[PDB]
Ligand binder design. Structure first.
Ligand SMILES: Nc1ncnc2c1ncn2[C@@H]1O[C@H](COP(=O)(O)OP(=O)(O)O)[C@@H](O)[C@H]1O
Lengths: 396, 57, 243, 396, 41
């Protein structure tokens, strides 16, 4: 019944730490949005952990898009400008634009608005990410629009996942080589067969999968001797698909943890191509679990898998991929396609290329490329190409 | 004569050293107490002694 | 900025001190660095610097936190145009500075470690005793790669990249030839030190670093000692030729 | 254009946390130094990370040196005294002296001054290490004097680096055995050859290396059968050199990280002897990198390396050390040198030692030492030494 | 000396140099031929 603590306190000491600043800023952000748009925005996230649509906001501002409007700065003496340039990224971006931190943005048509509120703690500058909307329906429609926008953005990029000791690292790349289907040098009957699945999966109406009741996933394996250009072929096929392309690099750090991470991330871009660079490098202790993420009882849909191996049996005894296609080295027909494409016609008459295709039996595409540099260098250095001389030099 | 960004002139109170007011009072009182009982003067040789052996003794 | 101030360069001007009773001077001397720099100059922490020609200014603002002394690195510019040009000028500035230091990447436990050194004994090309034709052909490929301008690699769509491998009985001039190249070309030279900590994560860091230094020479001594479980990845990283 | 945050504050709230105490103490330290020396000291380091000259300060005060003068105490009720005694050090130091923490010291002639300012944070007592100088030139001359003072201090010590899991651990030792060159029991022709390099490197004018244009580094390897006293010989040679001596103990924790650490630390004492205790224990995965730190393209100068191995080929196939010398077991001449030195003449007439040197063919120095204890114990216990009896007992 | 050193590496010629220069500097002799043997040994 008794109470040990009997101090009764003045009500100035019922005040909640931090709330006076924070509630004042939220009130002002709401007032300022009303002043500008005549509607009432409400707080939907106080310190939003989601990153996806915040990164769309930054790219929208970075890219001078019209859709998000700068509404206000938070603190007068914090940054009003910023730049994309981070020295840790492969491709530097030097764009200068209005700051994200210390600013309020709104998508007025969408009815949602963003504020990065700066604050000082532990002598670094941090921010609360605050998200507002005019009502529940617009909030939801905004969220439902996120993955579709991410999907279009990633069509224009190649996403590479590299497994490391902490986990997989995701880097985006600009598509500097556009590949059309006519540049995919390949046995024309399997080219036809494989693109049958590809075009249904990515380039048609998706009603097919419902009509014939077929799971919306596929996984194929490309195998053959070394040097037959498998990885270069897969990147050619991947680049002809109108859908986000992801590459997954097996490393010595590949675990069942990096597998689940990469598949979850690729699946966020579904439908997407997932290219598995040399599935041979996969540790034996994760191989069982890996195939169970392809075809086990809880496996998911949305991915077109393309792997490459020189040792097909070591990965998938038997078939838990759907089809395996053998890539041999090119016959005279394919050789000629390559030499016309690679640029031999720069210094070769039409007959000389027809002839050189004839003389290069047993050449890999790689070796035809190593031949290209040699005849090109002599042609540039001397004005002479001795194709005839150099095929022999390469044989022996 | 190079300018100074920060021109705030400080009050005498802002110079107080955190936690020193308690610590100095205690040390002084301990000294006085040791003198009152033994009539000799003790001073600090270690503020927070890292050594454990003679503390465990 | 620090190197500009340390070197007595003209182009950054000291504008003010922040707090009157924090440091107004500093010295480079770091007992952890292999080369000891004893230069005494104005402080970076607690000062404001400006590049008036470039319209960019730096302030390293000190503050007190958890006892220790820390600082915010504040960056100022006159307008967006001048800020962008400044940033676009960093890579070329660092390229020039690296022509005259040697960059060493050493793979440690976490990842790779980068130090910039000067070479302890410069080796002139003329002190590299060798078959004159072998010698001329090696020095010529290097000299032609960086200085003959590459109408070739462009007209035929061939990646602008070359690799040569030096091999032979020890004590006969591999290292000596390599040292002689550092001095004698107008491009940075970087050494990659393979260790037992060399990993796929580490190969990624060195090539991202090396390629930021391009055009440059990346030297890989004792390439036979590269661990087996990363040889595959290393080949895939070389073929990442586009970058 | 709008600002969310519109509170304007009284200027008492522009005050910088912590600065009021700190600037007050710096002002007072400067005023007190002026009061005592008539010059103006300026702050050159607010919380100095350098340890080297701070440890010279402590040793200078500890050792009653005249050169640093106690100027002032910071806080009246913090420590005015301290002692070297740390229970974690091998050799205990019980010296009592004026405190470092809570004090201001000056080297007046040098024109630099030190203050360890105490402060309470997280309920431990810490300090800012603050460094002052009268001007840039004196600051620089002080810094340039540090490594030379460290070098003399370390001549009088042996520094042992032991590789552990965190890294290498450095312990200093007092030189309790002075070794003169005449006590280095060794084949007198290689003694002559090796000391040719040693004396040029450490005990002569260094112009030689410039005249003949020779790199200022050397590394030699001492090898041979086990039990021929190699480690005892290297410590004998090392102790005759007038330069800091460092020992490096390879352990199971030796990595390329501990290698770089130890070489950097030894090099800070250049010129110095670096003794490598049993280079055999070095893990195979660091051996390639180790030799590249001896002779690779970025290898440095200043060290005379001396290693010992029982398996010379396992370390350095071929030579990346400069010379390798074989230590056999001692001939009659060396045996006699040892027995006179070790103390056999205590209980042996001159002839008996000449005779005992004769009878001990195939003995290692170690076994001659094990013989010493036995004949000595009998001589002490009984007054009899039966050398003749005991060589045979040791053979069989 | 160039014919007496058939089969030598440059690095061994460099150790021959340092050893000769030492003996020259410290003693006024060079002993180039004794040293060639000492190093094949
Ligand atoms: N070709 C050469 N020209 C000049 N000096 C050489 C040559 N080869 C070896 N040396 C000397 O021997 C030492 C070791 O040579 P190095 O170039 O490291 O050989 P490698 O790296 O091929 O084993 C060098 O530091 C140099 O002093």
């Amino acid at each position: 019944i008794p109470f040990i603590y009997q101090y009764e306190e003045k009500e100035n000491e019922r005040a909640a730490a931090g709330y006076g600043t924070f509630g004042y800023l939220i009130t002002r952000i709401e007032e300022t949005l009303y002043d500008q748009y005549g509607v009432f925005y409400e707080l939907y996230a106080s310190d939003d952990p989601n990153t996806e649509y915040w990164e769309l906001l930054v790219e929208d501002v970075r890219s001078g898009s019209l859709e998000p409007e700068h509404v206000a700065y938070i603190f007068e003496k914090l940054e009003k400008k910023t730049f994309a340039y981070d020295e840790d990224e492969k491709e530097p971006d030097y764009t200068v634009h209005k700051s994200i931190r210390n600013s309020v943005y709104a998508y007025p048509e969408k009815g949602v608005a963003f504020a990065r509120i700066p604050y000082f703690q532990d002598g670094s500058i941090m921010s609360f990410d605050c998200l507002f909307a005019v009502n529940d329906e617009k909030m939801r429609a905004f969220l439902e629009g996120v993955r579709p926008r991410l999907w279009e953005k990633s069509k224009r990029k190649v996403t590479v996942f590299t497994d490391g000791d902490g986990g997989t690292s995701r880097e985006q790349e600009a598509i500097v080589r556009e590949v059309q289907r006519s540049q995919v040098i390949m046995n024309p009957l399997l080219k036809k067969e494989i693109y049958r699945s590809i075009d249904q999966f990515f380039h048609s109406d998706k009603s097919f999968y419902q009509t014939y009741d077929i799971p919306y996933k596929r996984g194929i394996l490309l195998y053959g001797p070394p040097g037959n250009g498998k990885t270069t072929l897969v990147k050619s096929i991947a680049g002809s698909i109108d859908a986000p392309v992801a590459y997954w690099q097996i490393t010595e750090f590949t675990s069942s943890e990096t597998i689940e991470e990469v598949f979850q991330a690729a699946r966020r871009l579904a439908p997407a191509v997932l290219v598995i660079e040399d599935i041979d490098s996969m540790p034996e202790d994760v191989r069982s679990f890996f195939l169970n993420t392809l075809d086990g009882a809880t496996s998911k849909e949305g991915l077109f898998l393309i792997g490459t191996t020189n040792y097909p049996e070591e990965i998938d005894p038997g078939g838990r991929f759907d089809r395996a296609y053998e890539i041999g080295l090119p016959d005279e027909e394919l050789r000629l396609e390559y030499m016309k494409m690679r640029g031999f016609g720069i210094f070769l008459s039409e007959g000389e290329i027809k002839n050189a295709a004839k003389l290069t039996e047993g050449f890999s595409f790689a070796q035809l490329g190593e031949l290209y540099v040699s005849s090109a260098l002599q042609w540039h250095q001397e004005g002479n190409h001795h194709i005839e001389t150099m095929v022999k030099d390469m044989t022996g | 004569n190079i300018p100074f960004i920060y021109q705030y002139e400080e009050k005498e109170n802002e110079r107080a050293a955190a936690g020193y007011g308690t610590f100095g009072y205690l040390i002084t009182r301990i000294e006085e107490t040791l003198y009152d009982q033994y009539g000799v003067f003790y001073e600090l040789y270690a503020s927070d002694d890292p050594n454990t052996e003679y503390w465990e003794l």
